[PDB]
């Protein structure tokens, strides 16, 4: 029931600051997840559907963000790289289900939708389920940056360079990620 607002959101957020939601003591139907649509992708790692009749609804978080089509299959357990070590990392654990559907004409315009970003330059790659906020310089090597963004030390974010004439794997896929736990 309560996660029909997470699918039609006019604006999602970038992967360097996504948005969880503690879902508390309510009915979750779970039959709107399977038999939802043919063009959705429904990889599930933790537990299988048509089994989840348990009293599971103890703060189920539904992550949501937006990435490239060739970058959807980085979000799996393990699978290190640029967006799964510095932005948003999954553990080798009870992550329930990951859904990824295509945003063909919701944001992809010809001058570029600029509010989608990803943090490419980060020291000490992430712990699982960790969110980053700060926008300071990376300090890769030598001389300390008191903040000018001068040399050998980069701005931590990066833009996204939208255009409709991209490939199938670079037009954005709107991705949501659930979570399962108990008390």
């Amino acid at each position: 029931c309560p996660f029909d607002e997470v699918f039609n959101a006019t604006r999602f957020a970038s992967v360097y600051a996504w948005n969880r939601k503690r879902i508390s003591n309510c009915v979750a139907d779970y039959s709107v997840l399977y038999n939802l649509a043919p063009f959705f992708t429904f990889k599930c790692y933790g537990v299988s559907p048509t089994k989840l009749n348990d009293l599971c609804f103890t703060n189920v978080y539904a992550d949501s963000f937006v990435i490239r089509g060739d970058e959807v299959r980085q979000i799996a357990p393990g699978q290190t790289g640029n967006i799964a070590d510095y932005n948003y990392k999954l553990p080798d654990d009870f992550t329930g289900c990951v859904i990824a559907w295509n945003s063909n004409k919701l944001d992809s315009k010809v001058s570029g939708n600029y509010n989608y970003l990803y943090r490419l330059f980060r020291k000490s790659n992430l712990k699982p389920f960790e969110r980053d906020i700060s926008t300071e310089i990376y300090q890769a090597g030598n001389k300390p940056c008191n903040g000018v963004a001068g040399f050998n030390c980069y701005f931590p974010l990066r833009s996204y360079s939208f255009r409709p004439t991209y490939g199938v794997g670079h037009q954005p896929y709107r991705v949501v990620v659930l979570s399962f736990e108990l008390l």
Epitope: K43, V47, S48, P49, G78
Partner: antibody
Amino acid sequence: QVQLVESGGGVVQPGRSLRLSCAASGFTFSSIAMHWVRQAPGKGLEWVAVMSFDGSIKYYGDSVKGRFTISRDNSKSTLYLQMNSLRAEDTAVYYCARGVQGYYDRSGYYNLDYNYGMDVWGQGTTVTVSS
Amino acid sequence: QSVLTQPPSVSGAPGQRVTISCTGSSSNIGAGYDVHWYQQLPGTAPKLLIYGNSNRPSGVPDRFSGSKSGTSASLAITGLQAEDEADYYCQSYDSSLSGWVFGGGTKLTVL
């Protein structure tokens, strides 16, 4: 840390059958699938076998079908590969390569993830058919 | 033999852009399944280079790119040094044999 060792190099006559053994060290062995690939010296790689999370689902290539069997043990942290009726072409190094975690499809059908590739590889040992 | 065709040896001058094309039939890329890339020095085991047609694991630089266009994929390296003169293989999954078939195996050089 994460690495894979293996054993079972051989010198093999016309008619023989053989078993391979690849241990695992460092990571969660009981969850991720496992792949076997081989490479004849002079040519490239060639996929051999795969076995799922529990062992219920296995697949085989055309050059190895009918003569090959597989098994794994989460207890001793080992992976096995027994091989029947070794013919006069299969002299190669044999890699045991870590796959990717399987996933659950809609309507409750467990199956392997077919998109991904093999992340971390062992060393490989060389069976040698001969005369 | 080999299922996926790629050229056996492609040369290279330092500082250039070198392509490695891997053509597969309409049953491994035509079903939508992905094309990967590996990196094998002689005397050792390969390492994973590109998975999911455009991604890269932790360890490889920014110069290793790839794509997937229809029934054929390609890899490109820009600003190559003398460190990488090893072989590269393309891997996909089909439904003609339901096996994880490879490519023929190219060969790169540094001049």
